[PDB]
Amino acid sequence: AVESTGNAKAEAESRAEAARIEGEGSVLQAKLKAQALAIETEAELERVK
Amino acid sequence: AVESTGNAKAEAESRAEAARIEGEGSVLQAKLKAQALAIETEAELERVK
Numbered sequence: 001a002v003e004s005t006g007n008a009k010a011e012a013e014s015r016a017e018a019a020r021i022e023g024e025g026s027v028l029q030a031k032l033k034a035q036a037l038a039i040e041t042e043a044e045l046e047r048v049k
Numbered sequence: 050a051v052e053s054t055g056n057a058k059a060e061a062e063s064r065a066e067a068a069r070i071e072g073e074g075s076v077l078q079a080k081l082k083a084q085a086l087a088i089e090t091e092a093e094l095e096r097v098k
Contacts, residue, residue: 004063005059009066020074023082024081026081026082035092037093
């Protein structure tokens with residue numbers, strides 16, 4: 001019981017870790033993507049104007 | 050009886066463990082996904098506006 005629960009807990013917490021780093025990393029990368037799209041669509045809107 | 054119930058209990062608790070880590074991990078990852086979709090659709094709604 002301790003063995004199977006141990007390994008399953010290990011793989012599961014591994015997925016939780018990957019999910020967390022993917023989480024915050026998605027947050028920051030989406031934020032820089034937000035600034036990028038913002039400045040790009042801004043200059044684009046200007047010159048197109 | 051103790052043997053079969055023991056092994057079945059082990060595998061079952063293993064599934065419970067995986068279900069729990071999948072649970073909270075789904076919670077946190079869905080939350081970061083929520084912030085990501087929020088900021089992304091926010092900046093998107095702005096520039097599109």
